[PDB]
Amino acid sequence: GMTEYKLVVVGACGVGKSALTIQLIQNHFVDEYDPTIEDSYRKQVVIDGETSLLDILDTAGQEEYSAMRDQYMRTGEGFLLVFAINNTKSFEDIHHYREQIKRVKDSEDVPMVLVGNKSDLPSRTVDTKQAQDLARSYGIPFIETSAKTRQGVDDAFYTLVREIRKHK
Numbered sequence: 001g002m003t004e005y006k007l008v009v010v011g012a013c014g015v016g017k018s019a020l021t022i023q024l025i026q027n028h029f030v031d032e033y034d035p036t037i038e039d040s041y042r043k044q045v046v047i048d049g050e051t052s053l054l055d056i057l058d059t060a061g062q063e064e065y066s067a068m069r070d071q072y073m074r075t076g077e078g079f080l081l082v083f084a085i086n087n088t089k090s091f092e093d094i095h096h097y098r099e100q101i102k103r104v105k106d107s108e109d110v111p112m113v114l115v116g117n118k119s120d121l122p123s124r125t126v127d128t129k130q131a132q133d134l135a136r137s138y139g140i141p142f143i144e145t146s147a148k149t150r151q152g153v154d155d156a157f158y159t160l161v162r163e164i165r166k167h168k
């Protein structure tokens with residue numbers, strides 16, 4: 001009865017993909033999550049009054065082209081583009097992730113949310129306005145999160161569901 005959405009969490013090594021996902025699903029912050037574990041999780045969620053089943057893939061692996069990775073990513077319906085607000089390289093890498101999503105999905109207008117994680121840290125190198133201007137250019141929402149404090153974590157995933165509902 002309820003819609004199911006396949007969501008995929010992407011972004012550079014160490015930005016908090018696993019921490020964000022494990023906060024959403026299990027309600028705790030993981031300090032040292034094995035950077036090889038790629039796994040999916042399911043969660044029923046009510047968003048704007050309507051329940052959906054989220055099937056969430058937390059990506060991991062090697063920095064390499066993989067045809068089989070393409071085939072799996074093509075089945076994703078929406079993507080979280082995660083960077084860390086204290087890591088300029090992770091923010092520069094966003095463009096590469098968006099390009100790969102569009103490549104494997106035939107240049108669809110893929111539902112995406114830009115996520116600035118580690119908002120609890122005072123060591124910021126990427127300003128809120130720079131990430132808002134990038135999100136504006138791409139036509140997507142921007143959310144600031146902290147997997148450590150839980151701030152914005154539900155909003156990031158909910159916003160992505162809102163984006164898929166608008167697209168479908």
Ligand SMILES: */C=C\C(=O)N1C[C@@H]2CCOc3c(Cl)c(-c4c(O)cccc4F)c(F)c4ncnc(c34)N2C[C@H]1C
Binds near residue numbers: 010014035066100104
């Ligand atoms: C510390 C290891 C780690 O987290 N990463 C990030 C990432 C892990 C997932 O692999 C990547 C993926 Cl899914 C894509 C990708 C493709 O291939 C198609 C569509 C969407 C999409 F996100 C990449 F483009 C990647 N590019 C480089 N490296 C990775 C991926 N990863 C390995 C490593 C940096």
Ligand SMILES: Nc1nc2c(ncn2[C@@H]2O[C@H](COP(=O)(O)OP(=O)(O)O)[C@@H](O)[C@H]2O)c(=O)[nH]1
Binds near residue numbers: 013018033118121
């Ligand atoms: N201070 C802070 N550290 C974080 C946050 N999110 C993740 N981390 C830490 O950053 C490191 C990398 O996180 P992880 O989720 O493993 O990143 P992944 O490689 O993207 O899966 C870990 O030590 C986390 O505990 C956050 O919001 N704030």
Ligand SMILES: [Ca+2]
Binds near residue numbers: 138140
């Ligand atoms: Ca848009």
Ligand SMILES: [Mg+2]
Binds near residue numbers: 018034059
């Ligand atoms: Mg991880």
